Design a protein around this ligand. Structure first.
Ligand SMILES: C[C@H](Nc1cc(Cl)nc2c1cnn2[C@@H]1O[C@H](COP(=O)(O)CP(=O)(O)O)[C@@H](O)[C@H]1O)c1ccccc1F
Ligand SMILES: C[C@H](Nc1cc(Cl)nc2c1cnn2[C@@H]1O[C@H](COP(=O)(O)CP(=O)(O)O)[C@@H](O)[C@H]1O)c1ccccc1F
Ligand SMILES: [Ca+2]
Ligand SMILES: [Ca+2]
Ligand SMILES: [Zn+2]
Ligand SMILES: [Zn+2]
Ligand SMILES: [Zn+2]
Ligand SMILES: [Zn+2]
Lengths: 514, 514
């Protein structure tokens, strides 16, 4: 018995087709993804294959003006029109709190929403009871497939789920749920969730009875053969894990932003054993036409969003690189721009630090360089604040050592800077990679760069996320000597662009490697 | 017979008292120089000494809003009120051409104006005949003192004297004039002129009959003992040169901007031989009160100049270091600001070069950081243009080697930059001191720094002065592949400050030493 699993993850409000880098579609002839194109491809596979499941591994929430305005109502609506079979909750599904998850999505989805390791307590338990489920048994032709969900244990430190939700260890919460399915004679079981590729491999290894793992959270691109675009595969598709009980368990993920439709075909025997599996994610490029019905419905919902692109804030004559392959690995000019807007809005305060993972989109300059509220909303969608903090020289040095402690994994903690000249030597031991750290003086008439002093104290502008110890910056939350709340992140950057009129940030050598 | 020589040079329109750095007087209690303070001190010496000569060694012209507006009429007027005895022509006396020298100064001075090496030809010879003289024999008590003038041979490459004035070698033109004085039995001879300290020493050495050399042009500070301010002496005051005929010839200079009054007492015998000489420049600080009559006359002329300080263009929160001890020796933030205004006014063009000698004043930030047209007029008083030029990588490298070829002499050719990261190793041979030269790409979507290529061509914004081979940049004039005239220097910087509203340029590492 053959099963076709179609899967998306980390779509992040890319409801309309996008540029190849996932920013706003400017050149329509080479645009990618979007729910209208996704619908065409799914439909084509549903005609060809009898046993199809369309799954989402979370993080449909947050990313573009679509979510800023519609707050998840667009997610429920367009996921229903695509006839998704199930969805696992991701961390961004808690961004507007539990109320922002319950009212627009949990109450409006025509498909089960899953998570087995999320436990509700206190006054919330009675309110959220049954709105999400640990698992769902789905009829697929003449058989049944059991789907178990899971969500990142790190959600309380990444989002706003509130104090009445407990995020348990995925493996500990999944085993009794999979055990329960085996007793109801469900012999085909998919673990669908949002904890990242490393957790996905461990669940494949440790949770007895799991046949396939469909994941997300780490924007993992997997491919067999020659990749069709910019994305470099982290492994073969499917990634095979040998479980502790000796089974070959396929592990799948499909990057992010709706650029690819994950596609895996599994051959099961009558007892639910996996004989074989094969596939690859499908590039949703311009060769696949957008569905007309879905596009016309998208264009209806698009009307209300047009007042966020009517006003021109300013222009860029440079590509504004807010891509994760740049901003999580080296100095990126989107990072320099945002840090220059942070220092400019506060002017003394000479220094800025900004987690690269907080930059969520590039901005393309070819649209006659137009920067709208819509372009900026994709770069900074969280609605955070840029705060002033007082730090020891020693604390700041620990922060920069933390910035590169596990360098090479596309982790969000890599810092973009302003008024700081840092030099890293990656050949050195974690916690000892900063070889040079020069800072801009504040107690001088002519600002210039001098080596940071451990026994000195400095004023730093940074996101409140970092001031509260986000991204593992425990030393900042713990060791800060003063904290003042600042202005709204998007307004800081918007005011600066308007002031400059035309912007051209460069990669200047604020961050170097030795 | 004892003679007191009081002398000024390179006053450069500092008619009013200034800050210690020679910019606008903000804190009156610690202000310096000015013609009112100069008058008090001269008067005090005239009461004490019977044989006094008040001399000016040129460059009274150009420097502040006083010259921009009054065009030399203020020079004639205030030099007359101070009762100067003679003045040698400097290069800045030709800035408004010969017409701008003849009508406001040559026709209005109540004292002889001198230069023996300037020869008029063509239709100009009959117009300027007798308006300036090669020498003047002056009665001083019961004796006569002969004063011979000279002007820098480099004036045609520094100013606008036109095509009808020939600047001959100083020594060749001075000897027959001094010879003529010896025949009229003038046995006391002062060479007063504007060619710089190195020429002054050579004239002292080579021109037979010259008793003393009173110079200017090189802003040379000379002192015996412990200096009273920021200025570091280049030697003792007077600087002694032994002439080829065996005489001890004192050589004097008094820095610039009217901060010091040069003071030299010479003991002559009845035959005009110099027995002895001694003195030192006098710091014209707040301890010397400004003359009330002169101050009230200054305040009368000050009224018309107040409409250049009424409008606030913007604010600075940093000291804007346009001092020659910074801008001719290392990266200075006034240089970075002007280069950022040059690139901003033209935006591709990514690179800027600016001769440090072209920056003529700092701007102080303590006046609530106010930047007026008057502050800017002292920084950029020449009214030049910032032009676009196309240069070979090899040409640009030659220019940067020229920039530091004779480093250490406070020479104007040292370049301030924009979109360029240069590293110098001064321990190396002239013409081979550039060890690193990285430039900002133009043919890229994300601007970043890459090593300059010799066989590549680049668009550079620079002053027309440099595009015409000024400051010995013969390779720029000779090797440029394209030249386009730009916008007026002061307007470029003014428009940029207005756009920024608040400025804070730093010293960033655009220029480094290895
Ligand atoms: C302020 C707070 N949260 C944040 C503020 C800022 Cl400035 N950055 C943040 C977060 C959370 N994560 N991050 C970065 O995202 C990266 C992870 O991204 P990823 O690899 O693509 C996988 P993900 O898609 O699940 O995020 C982290 O490493 C962090 O750098 C919030 C408040 C209201 C709404 C939504 C919010 F998030
Ligand atoms: C454009 C042209 N000239 C110039 C334009 C620019 Cl951008 N810079 C210039 C000049 C001339 N000199 N300079 C710098 O001044 C330095 C010399 O200064 P100094 O040591 O203080 C002794 P100085 O007082 O006699 O100048 C030179 O080395 C050069 O760097 C002009 C046109 C109309 C009016 C007045 C002009 F000059
Ligand atoms: Ca099974
Ligand atoms: Ca003599
Ligand atoms: Zn995500
Ligand atoms: Zn996630
Ligand atoms: Zn001068
Ligand atoms: Zn001069």
């Amino acid at each position: 018995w053959e099963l076709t699993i179609l899967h998306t993850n980390d779509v992040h409000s890319r409801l309309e087709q996008t540029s190849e880098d996932s920013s706003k579609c400017v050149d329509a002839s080479r645009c990618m993804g979007g729910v209208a194109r996704l619908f065409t491809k799914v439909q084509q596979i549903r005609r060809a294959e009898p046993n199809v499941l369309l799954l989402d591994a979370g993080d449909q929430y947050q990313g573009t003006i679509w979510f800023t305005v519609y707050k998840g109502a667009e997610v429920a609506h367009f996921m229903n029109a695509l006839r998704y079979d199930a969805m696992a909750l991701g961390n961004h599904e808690f961004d507007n709190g539990v109320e922002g998850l319950i009212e627009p999505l949990l109450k409006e989805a025509k498909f089960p929403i899953l998570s087995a390791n999320i436990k509700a307590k206190g006054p919330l338990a009675s309110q959220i009871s049954g709105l999400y489920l640990p698992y769902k048994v789905l009829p697929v032709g003449d058989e049944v497939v059991g789907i178990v969900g899971y969500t990142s244990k790190e959600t309380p430190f990444l989002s706003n789920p509130g104090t009445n939700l407990v995020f348990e260890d995925e493996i500990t919460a999944l085993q009794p749920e999979v055990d329960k399915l085996k007793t109801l004679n469900v012999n085909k079981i998919i673990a669908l969730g949002h904890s990242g590729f490393e957790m996905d491999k461990l669940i494949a290894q440790k949770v007895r009875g799991v046949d396939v793992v469909v994941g997300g959270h780490s924007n993992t691109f997997l491919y067999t053969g020659n990749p069709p675009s910019k994305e470099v595969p982290a492994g073969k598709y499917p990634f095979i894990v040998t479980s502790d009980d000796g089974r070959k368990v396929p592990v799948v993920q499909a990057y992010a932003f709706g650029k690819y439709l994950g596609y895996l075909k599994i051959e099961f025997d009558e007892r639910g054993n996996v004989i074989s599996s094969h596939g690859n994610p499908i590039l949703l490029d311009s060769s696949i036409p957008e569905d007309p019905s879905i596009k016309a419905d998208i264009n209806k919902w698009r009307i209300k969003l047009d007042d966020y692109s009517t006003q021109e804030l300013g222009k860029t004559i440079v590509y504004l690189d807010g891509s994760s392959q740049s901003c999580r690995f080296r100095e990126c000019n989107m990072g320099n721009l945002i840090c220059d807007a942070m220092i400019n809005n506060n002017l003394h305060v000479s220094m800025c630090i900004l987690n690269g993972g907080g930059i969520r989109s590039p901005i393309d300059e070819r649209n006659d360089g137009t920067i709208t509220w819509e372009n900026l909303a994709a770069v900074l969608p969280f609605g955070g604040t840029f705060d002033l903090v007082q730090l020891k020289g020693s604390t700041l040095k620990k922060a920069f050592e933390h910035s590169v402690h596990r360098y090479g994994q596309s982790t969000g903690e890599f810092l973009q800077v302003g008024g700081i000249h840092v030099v890293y030597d990656l050949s050195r031991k974690p916690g000892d990679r900063v070889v040079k750290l020069d800072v801009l003086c504040t107690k001088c008439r002519v600002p210039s760069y001098d080596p940071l002093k451990m026994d000195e104290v400095y004023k730093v502008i940074l996101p409140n996320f970092l001031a509260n110890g986000g991204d593992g910056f425990q030393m900042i939350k713990d060791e800060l000597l003063r904290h003042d709340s600042g202005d709204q992140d998007i307004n800081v950057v918007s005011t600066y662009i308007s002031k400059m009129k035309v912007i051209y940030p460069a990669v200047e050598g604020r961050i170097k490697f030795s």
